[PDB]
Design an enzyme around this catalytic site. Sequence first.
Site, short mmCIF file in Angstrom:
data_model
loop_
_atom_site.label_atom_id
_atom_site.label_comp_id
_atom_site.label_asym_id
_atom_site.label_seq_id
_atom_site.Cartn_x
_atom_site.Cartn_y
_atom_site.Cartn_z
CG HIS F 202 42.01 83.74 56.52
ND1 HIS F 202 40.64 83.66 56.63
CD2 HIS F 202 42.44 82.49 56.22
CE1 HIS F 202 40.26 82.42 56.43
NE2 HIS F 202 41.33 81.69 56.18
CB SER F 206 49.68 83.12 50.52
OG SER F 206 49.22 82.53 51.72
CE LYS F 228 57.17 73.91 49.70
NZ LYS F 228 56.70 74.00 48.30
CG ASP F 229 54.77 75.33 56.70
OD1 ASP F 229 55.26 75.53 55.56
OD2 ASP F 229 53.86 76.03 57.17
CD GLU F 272 71.66 93.78 69.83
OE1 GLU F 272 72.21 94.76 69.30
OE2 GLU F 272 70.84 93.88 70.75
#
Lengths: 54, 126, 93, 93, 248, 385, 385
Positions: F202, F206, F228-229, F272
């Site tokens: 923050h 981004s 959009k998310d 795994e």
Amino acid sequence: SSLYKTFFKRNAVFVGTIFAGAFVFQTVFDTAITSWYENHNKGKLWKDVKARIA
Amino acid sequence: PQSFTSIARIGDYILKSPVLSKLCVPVANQFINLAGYKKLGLKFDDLIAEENPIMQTALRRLPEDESYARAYRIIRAHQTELTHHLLPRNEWIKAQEDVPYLLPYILEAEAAAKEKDELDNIEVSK
Amino acid sequence: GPPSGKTYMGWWGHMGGPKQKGITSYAVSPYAQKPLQGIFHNAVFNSFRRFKSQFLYVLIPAGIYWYWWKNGNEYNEFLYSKAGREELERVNV
Amino acid sequence: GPPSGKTYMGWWGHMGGPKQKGITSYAVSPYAQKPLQGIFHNAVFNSFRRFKSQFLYVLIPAGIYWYWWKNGNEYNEFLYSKAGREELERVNV
Amino acid sequence: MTAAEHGLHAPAYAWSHNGPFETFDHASIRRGYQVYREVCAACHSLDRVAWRTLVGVSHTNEEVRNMAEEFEYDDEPDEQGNPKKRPGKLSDYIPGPYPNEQAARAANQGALPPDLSLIVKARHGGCDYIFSLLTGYPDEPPAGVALPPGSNYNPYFPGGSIAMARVLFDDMVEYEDGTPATTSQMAKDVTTFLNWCAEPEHDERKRLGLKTVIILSSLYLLSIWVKKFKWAGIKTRKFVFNPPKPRK
Amino acid sequence: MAFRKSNVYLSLVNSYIIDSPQPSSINYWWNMGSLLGLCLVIQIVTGIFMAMHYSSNIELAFSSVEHIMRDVHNGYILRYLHANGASFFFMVMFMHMAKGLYYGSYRSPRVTLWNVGVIIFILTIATAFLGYCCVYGQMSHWGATVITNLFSAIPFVGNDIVSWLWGGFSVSNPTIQRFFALHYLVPFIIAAMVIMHLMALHIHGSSNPLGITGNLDRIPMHSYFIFKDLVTVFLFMLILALFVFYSPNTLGHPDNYIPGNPLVTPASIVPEWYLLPFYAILRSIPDKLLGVITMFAAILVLLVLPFTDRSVVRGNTFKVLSKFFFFIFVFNFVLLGQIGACHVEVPYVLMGQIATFIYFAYFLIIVPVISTIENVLFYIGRVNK
Amino acid sequence: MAFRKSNVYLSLVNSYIIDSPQPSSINYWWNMGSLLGLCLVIQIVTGIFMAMHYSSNIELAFSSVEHIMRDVHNGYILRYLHANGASFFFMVMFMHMAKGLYYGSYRSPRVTLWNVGVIIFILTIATAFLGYCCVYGQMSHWGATVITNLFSAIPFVGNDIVSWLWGGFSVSNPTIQRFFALHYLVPFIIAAMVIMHLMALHIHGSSNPLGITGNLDRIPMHSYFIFKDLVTVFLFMLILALFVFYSPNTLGHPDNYIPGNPLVTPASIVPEWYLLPFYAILRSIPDKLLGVITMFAAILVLLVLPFTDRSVVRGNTFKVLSKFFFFIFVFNFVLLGQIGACHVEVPYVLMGQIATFIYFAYFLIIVPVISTIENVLFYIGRVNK
Ligand SMILES: CCCCCCCCCCC(=O)OC[C@H](COP(=O)(O)OC[C@H](O)COP(=O)(O)OC[C@@H](COC(=O)CC)OC(=O)CCC)OC(=O)CCCCCCCC
Ligand SMILES: CCCCCCCCCCCCCCCCCC(=O)OC[C@H](COP(=O)(O)OCCN)OC(=O)CCCCCCCCCCCCC
Ligand code: HEM
Ligand code: HEM
Ligand code: HEM
Ligand code: HEM
Ligand code: HEM
Ligand SMILES: COc1c(O)c(C)c(C/C=C(\C)CC/C=C(\C)CC/C=C(/C)CC/C=C(\C)CC/C=C(\C)CCC=C(C)C)c(O)c1OC
Ligand SMILES: COc1c(O)c(C)c(C/C=C(\C)CC/C=C(\C)CC/C=C(\C)CC/C=C(\C)CC/C=C(/C)CCC=C(C)C)c(O)c1OC
Ligand SMILES: CCCCCCCCCCCCCCC(=O)O[C@H](COC(=O)CCCCCCCCCCCC)COP(=O)(O)O
Ligand SMILES: CCCCCCCCCCCCCCCCCC(=O)O[C@H](COC(=O)CCCCCC)COP(=O)(O)OCCN
Ligand SMILES: CCCCCCCCCCCCCCCCCC(=O)O[C@H](COC(=O)CCCCCC)COP(=O)(O)OCCN
Ligand SMILES: CCCCCCCCCCCCCC(=O)O[C@H](COC(=O)CCCCCCCCCCC)COP(=O)(O)O
């Protein structure tokens, strides 16, 4: 039309139509997907095998 | 983190050599149009990352008329990329408008901070 | 409160980009335009244009590595056969 | 970061008190004075002055309730004796 | 590993409960408990299956209260502390045939036979392997293979040598509903039944998935539209730039 | 001012999920941050509701997992959401650190964001390993043996850490009981390291897929990137709902339904899938001390990446050569997962040694050489002289 | 600037524990906040190291607390530091809710700080109860039976809530096994509500025992109240160490060492000593439905305290009547912690009904009345007319 004034204008009656439209969607879509799933599998369920035990 | 004084030393040795300029300059401009930053309408010095104080310095010494065009080709590229399209063929940056307009402001503000570190570290003889 | 250092992002009004001037932006309200007006001619014609550019970087790094895997997974099943036991006893030894 | 509300405390420099003028604040280093200079005569004479003020605010709220608890706990033990079963039959029912 | 030490690849049979909308054949589980009881209840425990889960799946309520009252479980002791037994009820598990592990190893030449509660989920292949194991026994093993004394051959077991002998022979059980009990008919019916014992939710896991994939893919086409609706002011923005007066 | 900026708590909600200025040109790869926030809550909400039925003793570990899947109402939903929603944790997270490598989001000023990235990536490999060991199957017991026997190669302090981890002499009831109370804990360290991961993001915002500044054209988060998310939330809940309802045991191993028996080794002893490319690195060094270090330096080589990226433009978007060699690395991480699931046989013992060298020469040779040839080719392509 | 101010993480440390301007007149009652932060880490660290040995079944609950106290190295330290330290949590906190009730720290602008206090207080009552029922002693089985049968008084939704809460038909194996995975969790919710409690404090700062503005004389936190907190840390560690090594089972009930048997009821079921006042409020109402409300209203009546205090002066420091009636409230709260221990006998029902009227008439009747009289007496003592 005048569909906007009665339904989508007040948000208190917009979201009251979402919940009263989800109360009908729960009961109907579940019965419509159960009655298809057993009808597609007719002859394999226990309700049919219990009928062959005559 | 490459420091343009360095690549102008390797670059100007390649350009001055007649063998290497015949050889790897045709690979250079083939690398440019394959990179495809002109197709969004950007010159190359729009792409140089502007978050270090040697390049944030050279964005204040830029004249006002070029710092308004540079603030347009960036928003024209942010807008073209979020529509997931390319700019039309009459809006691409041609091979002659792709000029190093921020190279002299960087090279004079990078060699004036190399000099500052060669002056906090002088061992003066007696 | 206490201050903080310099950043490269401010907030609304003092975001810290360069001063811009003479760039004007028009936009129409989304209640006044048709959404999904171009789902066709973009899923067909634009999605091929994106696939024409960035597929030769996702096929040759998957053509080098899948030919390498299939040429060893086929080699493993040779020396663990009845035909390649004489080649097995010199590789592990 | 976003601008926040109006609070009643700032930070060092803009703390938000009234403007003060003409208040001089002399102080000596703790390396040059003796700590524990008055630990006696404060543990005797000062700690009696603090006790002399705030003890009728603690004792009378504990002299009403401890007398109340003790005058019930000795009435509870009278009812559950052999001498107080003719009174327990009239108050429990 | 060699192909012999890997086991033969169990092929892809056409089971009646494959596919996404199909359920188990509940007349092939009721015929598949009978092959469990009459053949492999001798040496295979089923210690995770309660008696109550068979009610309504392949047997009625009275057919399980007369199948659990054949066995005997440990009651709480009497008013003198002596141990005692009681006939079973609907809340008990299906009792294994051996009291401890060493009794199981002693009866089968050292080999502990595994508990068949989760044996289809715990094998590479699922029910395509458990079926093809039981019918995969050759009459005589291939040439050159030296079997140890007391180990049977079938290729589908990893290693080649298995300790279970060939057990399913034709018409060894007699089905209730008049079904031809061959080796392949019996081996299909336990392999459905052992598939049920490891997955008792398989009827209802596949119909809750029909509710969820229908909702959560009509909640995804809707959320594509509301993204394209709210982003229509940004995806059709227009910038024009005319450069300002340079005298400033 | 508005109440969403004037309240003490809502100003944190406002500045993070409502008014946070995101760049306008970020594509769908920036939705992996919100997917991991959703996929962390699924591993916690279906962890508490599954730990109300889980007994952690070694005799009742595996028998209580079967008590969940057979007796608890919708226990088959709760466990399969937890075993497949943890494979989907490591598939969104592998597409979140590959967006970071590709779009240059490790470079300055976001190096303190990359470093808390590698810390969260470590505590999630640790959590998915402890939680796998709580089921006590034949791959879960024997996986805990081979991993915790690696610490007996530390010089002169070897056998006293291993016998401190185990709480005894082998993987026993003191181990599974402490591998549950540790595994319950660490997702409340991840959920407090993600708050230390949004704080480092923050301050600088981004990045964006062009690698240029985004301070010019910003749009808010609310009503633009909320919805959009919400496209990839409902897609992640759709590819999960095929791997929970319609094919739930595809990602897991079949041997994990055999109960944990310390006296028989299985045929192929393999953790795994997502821990597989960190298992073909460990197994490729023909030594025990260096094999532990090379496996631990396969995560800590992600920290030398801000200092070895010599490119002067940020991100691989406008580069040709350093975009090819990215996908050489990405389809080398996949091959390295397949060598980790094959037996130690020829030629897989040589494939796993070349494909380990390519994992450790991308970050240290291929990146600081290709991102130097590109800086010269951008210069001499335009500057005529 | 300095690195403690220039970093994204350290400036949260800087603005809270190093450079936070505290008023230079706060006495030793302002250390109870720093003790509760230490006393929370004591419960959490001696919960993780104790839950590595604890099995939560109803058969192995009480037998694996004794496995801690007999078989684990220093296990008697962990079980006693944490059963007594939980009883020191509620004694520091009761002196922390009574500093703020005395010095007027509930008033505006700190109503947001007070409301997160009552929320932390409810989760801490619910945490210490849910771990009490994890020992499965005789007082803890019959504690959980008496408490969770109070929810069978809600009309028509009573029995379905209780049978959901028990996870069965009585306090059985699913109740104790879910009262552990819940009780593991709620400390991490308290440890997040504490961070949401320092944010509500940091906007307006601490009060001071005079009740006047403290913006004039402020001294920092570092080397002044760090070293004023280290006095009471090393004192709280001392009085805890007497109650751990020299007299460890003084606070707890002796009946909690009987293994829990649902067939034999004990002589008198009491909770642990700190829930004993609210247990006497619950027992005072001769009705079951009103008792559940009034025992819950007695924690929620702290919220009407910012709106019933009608004083223009912050705190009781310079008040005669509102300092006398405060200590009647404190010694009434101790008496309710005594009627909670006595049986339901004459006259402990007329006492517990009167001494619960004084708990409620303090906030609703006494504090608005004696603080209006304490404002006319401050006025007509100075104004001459
Ligand atoms: C297995 C475990 C997975 C669990 C995670 C579940 C979520 C996985 C998400 C993967 C992903 O994020 O990839 C995004 C990829 C790149 O996005 P972009 O911004 O470059 O393209 C702009 C687009 O036109 C926006 O177009 P628009 O936003 O207008 O429409 C919405 C779009 C949503 O599609 C998606 O979310 C991706 C499927 O609707 C559709 O077109 C779907 C029609 C059926 O989307 C693409 O368009 C594909 C391009 C090639 C990438 C191949 C991916 C292979 C891994
Ligand atoms: C410990 C370290 C962890 C390291 C992680 C290891 C790798 C994990 C695998 C994750 C896969 C993620 C793939 C990379 C995703 C980020 C890169 C990307 O976003 O692709 C974009 C790329 C081109 O897009 P541009 O941004 O350049 O568009 C601008 C045009 N002017 O678009 C393309 O070129 C095509 C993208 C196609 C993606 C292919 C994914 C392959 C997945 C593996 C398949 C395995 C089975 C074969
Ligand atoms: C319908 C009949 C039967 C079924 C479905 C069945 C099922 C199975 C299965 C699935 C296995 C596991 C093979 C493997 O691990 O790969 C097995 C092994 C075994 N079975 Fe059978 N079984 C049946 C009958 C019997 C009988 C009657 C015996 C009596 C002795 C028996 C004894 C064993 C033994 C000893 C093993 C262990 C072999 C080994 O571990 O090598 N089985 N059985
Ligand atoms: C980032 C967080 C987490 C991840 C990646 C994760 C991953 C896993 C994995 C892979 C398993 C093995 C499942 C299997 O193979 O059967 C598992 C098991 C388990 N997890 Fe988690 N887990 C996480 C958080 C949690 C949390 C917070 C809890 C809280 C109690 C929890 C409780 C359990 C339990 C009880 C098991 C054993 C039961 C089972 O395997 O289904 N997990 N976890
Ligand atoms: C529990 C795991 C994680 C969570 C919840 C998380 C959360 C987020 C979120 C919400 C964002 C903003 C959305 C975005 O930028 O895509 C973000 C960005 C980022 N994350 Fe993660 N993250 C996690 C793991 C990781 C890991 C493991 C790494 C790297 C090793 C990492 C590195 C980054 C980077 C570099 C960015 C900035 C990308 C950019 O802004 O360009 N994160 N993270
Ligand atoms: C605010 C924090 C906490 C409080 C007030 C608290 C309180 C308590 C109390 C009162 C008991 C009963 C002690 C007894 O009667 O012997 C207890 C027991 C227990 N608690 Fe906590 N606890 C807290 C945090 C934790 C945490 C974080 C954990 C686990 C990670 C935990 C795990 C346990 C365990 C395992 C017991 C076992 C029973 C025993 O040996 O006493 N507690 N706790
Ligand atoms: C785990 C429990 C708690 C922790 C860690 C905690 C933490 C703190 C801390 C560190 C302070 C600053 C130091 C001080 O002012 O004394 C504080 C102040 C305060 N706390 Fe808490 N607290 C807790 C519980 C409570 C409760 C239960 C209440 C009230 C119902 C409360 C109400 C207050 C108030 C009113 C203040 C401000 C006092 C003032 O500075 O004037 N706290 N808290
Ligand atoms: C207003 O000014 C302040 C002030 O700002 C602060 C912060 C405090 C101090 C208050 C606090 C610090 C309270 C905050 C408390 C928490 C955030 C609780 C967090 C505590 C924890 C212990 C976190 C949990 C982490 C663990 C348990 C990790 C430990 C690891 C374990 C146990 C596993 C060990 C395993 C191995 C293999 C080593 C004050 O007292 C104060 O007034 C002076
Ligand atoms: C930069 O902009 C942002 C951004 O700011 C944020 C926040 C996110 C979102 C990221 C996250 C939300 C990740 C953060 C994740 C967490 C903080 C995890 C939090 C989860 C928990 C603490 C666990 C949840 C626990 C509970 C809800 C407790 C209740 C649970 C149970 C089981 C109680 C049951 C008891 C009873 C009686 C029913 C973004 O995606 C994003 O990019 C768009
Ligand atoms: C986290 C939960 C809350 C815990 C409450 C603890 C609050 C007080 C913390 C005390 C830390 C002291 C460090 C001060 C300091 O370094 O000043 C340093 C030097 O001080 C010292 O040398 C003190 C000697 C070391 C004291 C050791 C105390 C450890 C006891 C731990 C008990 C609490 C866990 C700087 O001081 P200066 O700026 O005046 O020069
Ligand atoms: C995981 C947490 C880690 C730390 C991150 C913190 C992020 C917290 C986000 C929480 C979002 C929801 C909070 C909404 C609360 C807003 C109401 C409010 O603040 O009003 C507050 C009162 O709050 C309360 O009473 C109870 C708050 C408890 C919150 C418990 C969740 C009053 O607001 P105001 O600022 O106007 O005060 C006027 C003073 N008379
Ligand atoms: C719910 C929130 C929970 C509480 C979170 C906030 C409080 C956390 C307090 C943390 C104090 C300890 C952190 C000290 C680390 C500071 C060093 C630093 O910031 O350097 C960072 C790099 O950090 C890292 O690489 C890893 C940090 C991970 C921290 C894991 C604990 C570089 O800092 P910077 O960008 O200002 O560099 C200037 C260049 N000279
Ligand atoms: C809280 C974390 C949960 C996240 C779940 C995401 C995983 C997707 C698979 C979910 C399957 C479990 C539900 C189910 O089986 O229902 C099935 C129906 O499918 C669905 O409705 C899925 C819709 C999911 C909507 C997502 C909204 C989430 C809001 C969360 C607010 C707390 C069965 O329903 P039924 O028992 O028949 O009533």
